[PDB]
Design a protein around this nucleic acid. Sequence first.
RNA 1: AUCAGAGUGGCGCAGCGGAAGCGUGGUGGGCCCAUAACCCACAGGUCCCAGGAUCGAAACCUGGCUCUGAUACCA
RNA 2: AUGUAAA
RNA 3: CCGACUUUGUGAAAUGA
RNA 4: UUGUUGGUCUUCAACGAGGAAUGCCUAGUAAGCGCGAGUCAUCAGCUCGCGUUGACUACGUCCCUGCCCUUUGUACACACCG
RNA 5: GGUGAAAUUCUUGGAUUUAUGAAAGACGAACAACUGCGAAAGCAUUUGCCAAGGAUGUUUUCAUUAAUCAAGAACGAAAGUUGGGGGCUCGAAGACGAUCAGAUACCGUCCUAGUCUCAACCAUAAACGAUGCCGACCAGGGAUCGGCGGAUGUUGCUUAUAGGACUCCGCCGGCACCUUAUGAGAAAUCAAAGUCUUUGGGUUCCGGGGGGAGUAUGGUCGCAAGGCUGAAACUUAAAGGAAUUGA
Lengths: 125, 95, 211, 64, 25
Amino acid sequence: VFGVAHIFASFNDTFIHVTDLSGRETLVRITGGMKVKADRDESSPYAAMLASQDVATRCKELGITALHIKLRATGGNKTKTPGPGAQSALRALARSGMKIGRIEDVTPVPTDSTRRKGGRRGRRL
Amino acid sequence: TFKRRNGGRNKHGRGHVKYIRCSNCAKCCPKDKAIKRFLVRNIVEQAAVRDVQEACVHDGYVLPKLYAKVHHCVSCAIHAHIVRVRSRENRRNRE
Amino acid sequence: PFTKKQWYDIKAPLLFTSRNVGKTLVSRTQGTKIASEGLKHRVFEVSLADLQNDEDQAYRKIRLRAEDVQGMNVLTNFWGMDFTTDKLRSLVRKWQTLIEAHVDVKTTDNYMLRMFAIGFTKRRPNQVKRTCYAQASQIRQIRRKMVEIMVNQAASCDLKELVNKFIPEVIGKEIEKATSSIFPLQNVYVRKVKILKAPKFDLGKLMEVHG
Amino acid sequence: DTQVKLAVVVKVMGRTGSRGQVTQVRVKFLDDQNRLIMRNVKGPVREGDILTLLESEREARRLR
Amino acid sequence: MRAKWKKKRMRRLKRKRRKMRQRSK
RNA sequence: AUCAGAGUGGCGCAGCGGAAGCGUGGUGGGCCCAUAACCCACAGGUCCCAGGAUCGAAACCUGGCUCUGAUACCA
RNA sequence: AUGUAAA
RNA sequence: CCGACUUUGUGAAAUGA
RNA sequence: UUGUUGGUCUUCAACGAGGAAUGCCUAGUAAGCGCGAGUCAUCAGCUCGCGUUGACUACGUCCCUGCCCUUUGUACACACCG
RNA sequence: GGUGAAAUUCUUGGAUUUAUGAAAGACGAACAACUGCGAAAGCAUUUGCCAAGGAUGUUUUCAUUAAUCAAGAACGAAAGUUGGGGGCUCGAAGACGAUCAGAUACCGUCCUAGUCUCAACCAUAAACGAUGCCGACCAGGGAUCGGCGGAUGUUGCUUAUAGGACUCCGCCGGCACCUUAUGAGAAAUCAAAGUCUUUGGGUUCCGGGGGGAGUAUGGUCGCAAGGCUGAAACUUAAAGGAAUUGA
Ligand SMILES: [Mg+2]
Ligand SMILES: [Mg+2]
Ligand SMILES: [Mg+2]
Ligand SMILES: [Mg+2]
Ligand SMILES: [Mg+2]
Ligand SMILES: [Mg+2]
Ligand SMILES: [Mg+2]
Ligand SMILES: [Mg+2]
Ligand SMILES: [Mg+2]
Ligand SMILES: [Mg+2]
Ligand SMILES: [Mg+2]
Ligand SMILES: [Mg+2]
Ligand SMILES: [Mg+2]
Ligand SMILES: [Mg+2]
Ligand SMILES: [Mg+2]
Ligand SMILES: [Mg+2]
Ligand SMILES: [Mg+2]
Ligand SMILES: [Mg+2]
Ligand SMILES: [Mg+2]
Ligand SMILES: [Mg+2]
Ligand SMILES: [Mg+2]
Ligand SMILES: [Mg+2]
Ligand SMILES: [Mg+2]
Ligand SMILES: [Mg+2]
Ligand SMILES: [Mg+2]
Ligand SMILES: [Mg+2]
Ligand SMILES: [Zn+2]
C-alpha cells in the first residue's frame, strides 16, 4: 500500500511528511528539528536520517508498505537546490526497509518571481 | 586601463539588458554578464543508488535528475571557485 | 487517533487499463462530519505508467477526481493532465526554439478545459549549423496551426474518448504530420489539460464510464 | 538500538581534516561482503585492519 | 564615494545659503 | 519663606538592622613588533556630620551641613 | 582598529 | 446593549441527559 | 667583612602538581642519572663535550606561525609597522 | 523561522507542513545567444487593429533637391514632485534583535514614502564604444542576422512539382569576433585610435598645470528638488596617464 512522503528539504531544517494518496490525510510528520537540540543541527544529515527512521517505524506500524517521494526545496523566489538533508533522509527510508515508488522534484518554480528579498546589492556580509 | 575588450559582458547592438538575481546573494546583475551554469545532477549520489533501486517496486525505474540553471554574480562566482582569476594571457580563452 | 479511521478503495474509470490506484482513509462518520458526502472531492495524482501498465508513458502525471463514493469504493473520474518536472525540463535546451499554444474548448458534454501543447524545432540530419531557430513569422504560423488542430481534433464528444486521444498522443504526433511543411517540429505533445468547469453531477454519467 | 558491526579497510583514500588528522578509508562489511561505504578513521590504519563501527548509516562524503 | 558625497555636502550647503537669503529678502 | 527629596568606591548608581556591591575606572601579568580591544588575577569605601534607642545600623527618630523640585492666591 | 614631530 | 418569558405554530437530524 | 668554600651540631620556612599564557622534542631521541673540560689560588645551580638507563606518540597536514615558486590586484617603494 | 551562531518574531486561540478552491496585485523563468529592433533612453506571455521603419530587389520617377549645423524644437533610465487609481512582493525613512570598544552599518525581524497605473512636471546617469556626424582609400579569415541570385538531393511534408526545413557557392546591408603588421601610438591597445613635421576631404561641439569650483553672483527655466549659463580673490610643484621590478 502506498503513501506519499512530502519531503521538504530546505536549508535550516527538513520535513519528512507522509500523507495518503490524496494529500488530504496526514499520516506522520517528523521534522529534523524534533531530533536534535541545537538550531544549527536541524538541517544536518544525521538529524535528517534520525527523522526518517522515526517516520518508517510509525509507517510500518500502520500498514502502508511502499511510498512515493516528492522532494522539495524552498523554491519560489529563493533557492531551488534541496537542502543538506535531502539525500541523507531519502537514503534512510530506503535503508530502513520500506519501499519507494516514483520520485519527483516538486520545488515551486515561478514563470517569473515577485521581487526577491535582499535589495539590489544582495546579501553582502 | 581597460582590462577586457568586451567590458565584462556580451552586449553589442543592444542598449539595455534586463538583470537577474544571483542565486547565492541575490545581487542584481545583467543577464549577459552573469555566470550561468546549467547543472544536471542526480537525486542521490552513487553512494545511495543501489540501496534505493533495491526499494523500487516497479522494475526498470531510472532515477530522475534535478535540472536547474543557476546564476551567479562575479563576487559569488569567484568566492565559490566556479571561475578563477586567470593569467593575462589565458584571459582570452573562451572554451 | 487513527483507530477511528476507515480506508477506501480508489478506482479509476474503465477507459484506464489498470484500476485500483491505491487506498485512501477517511475518519468514520460522526455528527456533521459524514465520510460519504462530506469530502467526496478528493483529487488524486497518479502516474500514467501505473495506470495502464505501460512504462513507455512514465511521464504524463494523470490528475484524478472523486465524483461519488459507493459502499467502500471511491469512484474516480479523469481530472487533468500534466508532465513531470523532469520530463518537461528534459525537453528544453539551448540552440533550439520553443513554441507554445493554448485554447479553451467545449466538449459535447460541457467540460470546459484548456489544453497546452509544446513543440521543439528539429535539427535535420546533415546539418552543420550550430543552432536550430525558426523565424518569428514561421513561429506564429506553427502556433496558429497548433491552435486550430486543438480546436478541431477536440470538439469531439467527451473526455471519455477525448482522453483516448491524449493517451497515445493522438494530438501530438498529428501536429507534426499536420505541419511538417513549415518547419520539422520534434517532441510535440499536449503538455497540460486543465478542466475549467464541469457540468452538474448527473449520476448516470459516472457508472457508464466507470467500473 | 545499533548493533556493533565490523568492517575491513579495503583501501585508503586520503588524509582529510584541517590538520590532516583523519585518514579516509573504504570499508567492507563482513555480514554482507558487498557494502563499500566511506568512513573516517582516526589513528594509523592500513588495508586489512578491521574497524569497529557503532553506527553505519553515518557515511563520509568525498573529501569530507 | 568621496566625490559623490562631496557633491551632497555642496548640495546641502547651497540649500542653506538660499534659505538665509529668503529670510533677509 | 517654608516643605518634600537626595548625600554610599575615582564617577553614575543600587543596598528591608546578620553588616558593601553593579557598570565603568585603577593596579600587576598575558596576547602584540607595539598600543588599544580581548584574557587572567589584585586592591579599593572619613556610608554627609553629631546624637540617641536598638540582640545588633549605611538603613530607625532627633538634631546640624550641602545640592534639587515645589506652593505661595482675592485685593 | 591603529602606527616617530624627533630627519 | 444583553437574556428569559410572551407573541410562538409546524417537523427533521447530531451530540445530551 | 656584606657569611670564598668544605665540615659538625642545632634552627625545619614556602611548596598539597601550579591561572591566563608558553618552550623543546620523532630513536639510543625525549626524559632520568652522573662524569670530564673551559673559567680557576679558592668558587659551577653556567656553557662545551661524554657516557649510563631508556620510552609514549606520529610516518601526516596546511588549520595557526612562517618559507619557496607561479598567477593575480595595488593609489605601497623608509615598501602594510605602507 | 532565521543565522557564522543566535535572538527579535510566530505557535495546542493548532504555528510550520500537506491538500482543494478563491481574490488581489506585481512579474513574464527555462528557450535567451559574443542574436534582433530602435535617434538615444529603451524594447521579451497570446491574438487582433492602427500608423511607422530599415535592408534587399527594380532597365519606375524627380533631377542636386545635399553634408553638418549658432538661434530654435521632439524624445530622454532610475530617483524625485502634484493629483486621482491600486497597494501582492520588495522596501529609503523609522522601530526593534544581534555583532561590536561603540555600530546611528554590514547580518536578522517588522514596516512608511516608493515600487505598479492615468493626467501633468522634472531633464539628469560610468545617459559608455568613456570613441560626434557625412565621404574616400586601405588585410586576410570563418561564423552569424535580413534580402536576393546560383547549384542536385533530401524529407514523416506537398492532389504533383514549385515553394517550406537542411547542404554548398556569390552579391548587398547589419551586430561582432579571430590572426597579423607593411601602419599608428607614451603605451595599454587599435583593422580603424591606420592613409600626420612627406603636416590641408567637409562640418559641429569642446581642452589649455593641480585646486578654489560647477562654488559665489546676475540672468533664466521649474511647484519644489533642482537644471542651464557661470567667475574671482587666494593657494600650490606637481597632480595625472601607460607600462616595469619588488613588496
Ligand atoms: Mg584595476
Ligand atoms: Mg542596429
Ligand atoms: Mg545605458
Ligand atoms: Mg565603502
Ligand atoms: Mg593591562
Ligand atoms: Mg597592552
Ligand atoms: Mg587615533
Ligand atoms: Mg589618524
Ligand atoms: Mg668545573
Ligand atoms: Mg614530514
Ligand atoms: Mg582590485
Ligand atoms: Mg613616493
Ligand atoms: Mg594599516
Ligand atoms: Mg495547520
Ligand atoms: Mg529574434
Ligand atoms: Mg515566456
Ligand atoms: Mg535603522
Ligand atoms: Mg551629463
Ligand atoms: Mg561624456
Ligand atoms: Mg571613413
Ligand atoms: Mg543568408
Ligand atoms: Mg555578412
Ligand atoms: Mg596651458
Ligand atoms: Mg585648468
Ligand atoms: Mg581619471
Ligand atoms: Mg597608474
Ligand atoms: Zn552573488
